[PDB]
Ligand binder design. Structure first.
Ligand code: PGW
Ligand code: PGW
Ligand code: PGW
Ligand code: PGW
Ligand code: PGW
Ligand code: PGW
Ligand code: PGW
Ligand code: PGW
Ligand code: PGW
Ligand code: PGW
Ligand code: PGW
Ligand code: PGW
Ligand code: CA
Ligand code: CA
Length: 626
């Protein structure tokens, strides 16, 4: 059905001249041939060729699979001795696709073709992608669209098709959804019986966050042992953009390495603090200014055309936060390049960590402003917001803009409504923008280009369609789930139905993300992983911060949703600070206890890998060494 194709290499010739294009193309085909791959060339687009790649021989494929397993075993990623090369069948499609992707991409000295798409020698090579297995995808979709949980076999199927990175994301999402049943039930019970800002709800929520994060750390270790990816960072793919200072030739492996001093990278990484403060200043200024405009227009201004003026600050936020975030991403990418980052995974993790500052600010600063600035203050702030009358000025006359004043009277519903927005309406709108609109845009751009050799015209047209799809990044889905967890950990006392909303959304999220991968994206090459990465630390940080924000909220809103109704008088600053101190330190103590208790419970795959290391050394001692 896929015509035995392993990868499609898109070669762009449009932006270069014919002689250089022919020379580069011959070099590409020669490298593919010399690394043991069989090529077939077809017209991809009007400006690109498709190089269809396949293992030239079953013997060569078995040899490459055996060498990959041997490298994994030598670097300690697996403990079982690699089976001989005559029995070296790829145990899944993910393994064959990974071996062939390495053959295509790892440098010539490392034993492959050095095709680095969108790099120096290969800027014409635009994309290297495998083909979706449409029947398997549709079977999986229809099968687990009718179940509650995905089986371990279902997760293994995802890993065997898309690799362990996508597999880890779906395993984490399934575990998060399963753990969300407890806070969903408990928060519905509290919303029914206690209402919001309940001490018991906040305590149970912090305890649940602790338990889920520690359980997932343990489960990640177990799953990386079960998928044979534990310690996979030892064989992390180098990135071709790495600028070494000196070239050293280690004696263990007869190769030059290209060393770069770690302390120099740390000096360059000192610039992350100024970047973080820049992003905080810019994004917080935009967000707080738009919040002040929103407050003025919606609650201080009392002139004509109030809806058409209250839609102003939401528009300005929706236009300016994406733009400022794109600028900050450009700055973060330039800083990530300045830091040298030998490996692609280190580069990706560092960029994700820089972007997490922007994510935190843009996701949580609105609710933080409403909760800890608008509610306690803003009876002392709205006198300073008369200056924002000019935002309404190009619509209303100067006198009508001035005589539009009212008793402020803080809206005791503002905070609950903002939390309900971010945890329900944002979820629905994000589902729409994430699955529906890209799908419709793809179908529209297809029928636009489709409206205005005979035996492979269908396969070739569907390959040309797959070539237009988006490049899936599992980091985006992990980011979304971690930001959602942050909402739960930080602001769930305001509205205890947040975990119910997240439970429903995450059941739908598993299926809709799998659909997006299979239908709206090119099939990702089966990248490996032994963890969700920096997102685990992000979740730990968010739960820590939530122990502070939730206790502050429970203190401030003890008397109800109004709490300090605009005045900071009722808030005793020592009692708020003492609440925060004891809550955060009870949190840290309970987290230490839970982590230490879970460290005493070794999971089965972890214990099996330890015993297997022992058994491998015993086999070595029994065969050689007498
Ligand atoms: C103590 C909790 C230890 C965590 C282990 C655990 O609870 O099992 C999971 C169930 O998750 C859950 O129901 C979530 C329950 C929340 C546990 C912690 C609540 C904080 C009190 C999955 O286990 P299963 O494979 O059987 O599905
Ligand atoms: C939910 C039931 C969904 C279902 O189909 O049953 C099995 C799930 O059971 C399950 O594993 C259960 C999944 C984990 C159970 C977590 C439920 C915690 C509910 C705590 C509420 C207390 C709140 C009390 C507040 C006053 C599925 O079969 P499997 O074998 O595929 O799973
Ligand atoms: C809190 C920190 C926030 C404040 C400022 C941002 C960080 C300052 C450092 C900026 C990074 C600039 C930097 O590292 O320069 C490199 C050389 O530096 C170096 O070997 C030595 C300079 C390092 C200076 C770091 C100490 C400044 C702060 C601690 C005192 C360039 O490499 P090369 O030489 O090839 O040109
Ligand atoms: C991110 C996507 C932004 C693009 C459009 C976002 C759509 C949006 O803001 O929702 C509207 C109401 O918003 C609001 O209550 C605006 C409140 C603040 C939200 C501002 C953006 C975050 C629709 O209202 P609904 O029909 O859902 O009721
Ligand atoms: C308040 C903070 C505002 C800016 C935030 C940091 C943004 C960092 C900008 C990224 C950066 O460092 O630029 C590099 C220059 O390296 C540098 O010699 C600048 C280091 C500054 C030393 C202090 C480019 O790399 P190269 O020079 O190789 O071309
Ligand atoms: C981002 C902005 C976060 C906002 C934080 C503080 C603003 C308050 C600054 C101090 C202004 C104090 C002005 C003042 O005179 O008020 C006095 C009492 O204050 C008072 O009861 C002090 C009450 C201030 C209420 C603020 C409680 C915040 C609790 C923890 C939130 C951290 C969330 C961070 C998550 C990342 C007496 O009259
Ligand atoms: C779809 C594209 C646009 C999204 C429309 C916005 C969705 C919407 O307004 O529904 C929410 C409530 O829904 C819900 O509780 C249930 C909606 C479930 C949607 C699935 C229906 C099948 C709003 O809630 P509230 O009234 O606070 O405003
Ligand atoms: C895809 C993502 C799906 C998102 C999940 C959708 C729904 C579950 C979350 C509940 C949605 C409720 C949104 C509308 C809502 O807040 O209604 C509340 C009352 O009715 C409800 O309590 C609804 C019952 C729960 C307000 O009145 P309150 O409770 O504040 O007093
Ligand atoms: C978490 C941080 C947010 C909470 C800490 C915010 C500090 C709140 C504060 O200033 O203390 C209150 C006002 O000061 C006073 O009455 C007398 C002191 C007035 C001096 C001005 C306060 C500077 C606060 C700025 C400090 C850095 C921020 C006293 O409150 P109370 O007496 O009711 O007890
Ligand atoms: C309940 C009250 C709640 C608040 C009350 C007081 C707060 C006092 C501040 C405490 C400051 C310490 C905060 C804390 O929780 O420490 C835990 C570690 O425990 C530890 O090392 C274990 C050392 C235990 C110290 C022996 C107890 C002191 C004797 C006193 C006994 C009286 C009863 C955190 O673990 P974690 O994972 O972050 O590792 C970090 C690692 O790098 C530091 O060794
Ligand atoms: C140990 C962990 C907590 C110890 C208790 C905190 C000790 C310090 C208490 C400080 C003094 C105190 O008792 O607080 C009273 C009320 O507090 C309150 O409603 C409630 C205080 C907040 C309770 C703490 C929230 C729970 C945080 C969950 C963390 C668990 C993490 C680890 C667990 C797994 C004051 O009344 P007040 O008239 O001035 O109010 C005015 C206000 O309502 C303005 O609207
Ligand atoms: C809440 C339960 C808190 C109990 C202390 C949490 C705990 O179990 O720590 C153990 C020993 O560490 C300790 O320093 C024991 C200190 C015990 C004293 C804590 C009780 C009151 C203080 C495990 O430590 P290890 O990593 O060796 O396994
Ligand atoms: Ca979504
Ligand atoms: Ca998603």
């Amino acid at each position: 059905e896929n015509h035995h194709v392993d990868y499609v290499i898109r070669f762009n010739y449009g932006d270069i001249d014919t002689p250089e294009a022919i020379k580069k193309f011959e070099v590409l085909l020669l490298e593919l041939s010399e690394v043991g791959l069989q090529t077939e060339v077809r017209q991809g687009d009007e400006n690109s060729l498709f190089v269809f790649v396949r293992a030239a021989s079953k013997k060569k494929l078995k040899r490459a699979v055996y060498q990959s397993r041997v490298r994994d075993w030598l670097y300690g990623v697996r403990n079982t001795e690699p089976e001989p090369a005559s029995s070296a069948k790829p145990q899944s499609e993910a393994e064959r696709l990974l071996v062939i992707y390495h053959l295509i991409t790892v440098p010539k000295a490392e034993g492959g073709a050095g095709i680095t798409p969108r790099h120096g020698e290969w800027k014409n090579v635009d994309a290297i992608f495998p083909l979706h297995d449409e029947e398997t995808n549709r079977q999986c979709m229809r099968e687990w669209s009718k179940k509650t949980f995905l089986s371990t076999e279902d997760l293994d199927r995802i890993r065997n098709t898309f690799g362990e990175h996508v597999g880890f994301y779906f395993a984490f999402l399934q575990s998060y959804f399963r753990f969300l049943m407890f806070p969903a039930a408990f928060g519905f019970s509290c919303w029914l019986l206690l209402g919001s800002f309940s001490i018991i709800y906040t305590v149970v929520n912090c305890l649940w966050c602790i338990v889920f994060i520690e359980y997932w750390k343990r489960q990640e270790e177990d799953l990386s042992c079960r998928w044979q990816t534990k310690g996979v960072s030892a064989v992390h793919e180098k990135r071709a953009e790495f600028k070494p200072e000196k070239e050293i030739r280690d004696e263990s492996t007869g190769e030059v390495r290209g060393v770069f001093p770690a302390t120099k990278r740390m000096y360059r990484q000192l610039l992350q603090v100024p970047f973080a403060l820049l992003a905080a200043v810019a994004l917080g200024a935009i967000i707080a200014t738009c919040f002040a405009i929103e407050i003025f227009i919606s609650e201080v201004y009392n002139g004509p055309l109030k809806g058409y003026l209250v839609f102003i600050p939401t528009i300005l936020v929706s236009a300016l936060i994406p733009t400022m975030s794109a600028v900050l991403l450009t700055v973060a990418t330039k800083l990530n390049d300045y830091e040298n980052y030998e490996t692609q995974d280190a580069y990706k993790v560092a960029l994700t960590q820089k972007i997490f500052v922007v994510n935190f600010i843009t996701s949580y600063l609105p609710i933080i402003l409403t909760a800890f600035v608008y509610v306690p203050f803003a009876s002392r702030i709205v006198p300073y917001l008369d200056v924002f009358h000019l935002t309404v000025r190009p619509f209303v006359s100067k006198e009508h803009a001035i005589k539009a004043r009212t008793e402020f009277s803080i809206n005791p519903d503002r905070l609950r409504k903002q939390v309900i927005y971010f945890t329900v309406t944002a979820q629905i709108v994000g589902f729409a923008l994430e699955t529906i609109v890209p799908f419709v845009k793809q179908r529209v751009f297809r029928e636009y280009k489709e409206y205005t050799d005979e035996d492979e015209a269908r396969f070739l047209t569907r390959v040309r369609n797959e070539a237009e799809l988006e490049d899936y990044d599992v980091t985006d889905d992990l980011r979304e789930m971690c930001i959602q967890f942050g909402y739960l950990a930080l602001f769930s006392p305001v509205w205890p139905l947040v975990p119910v909303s997240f439970l429903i959304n995450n059941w739908v999220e598993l299926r809709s993300d799998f659909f997006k991968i299979c239908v709206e994206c090119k099939r990702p090459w089966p990248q490996r992983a032994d963890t969700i990465g920096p997102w685990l630390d992000s979740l730990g940080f968010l739960s820590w911060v939530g122990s502070i924000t939730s206790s502050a909220l429970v203190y401030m809103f003890s008397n109800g949703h109004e709490g300090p109704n605009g005045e900071p008088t009722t808030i005793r600053c020592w009692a708020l600070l003492l609440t925060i101190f004891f809550s955060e330190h009870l949190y840290l103590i309970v987290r230490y206890a839970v982590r230490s208790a879970l460290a005493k419970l070794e999971p089965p795959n972890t214990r099996r890998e330890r015993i297997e290391r022992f058994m491998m050394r015993k086999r070595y001692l029994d065969t050689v060494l007498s």
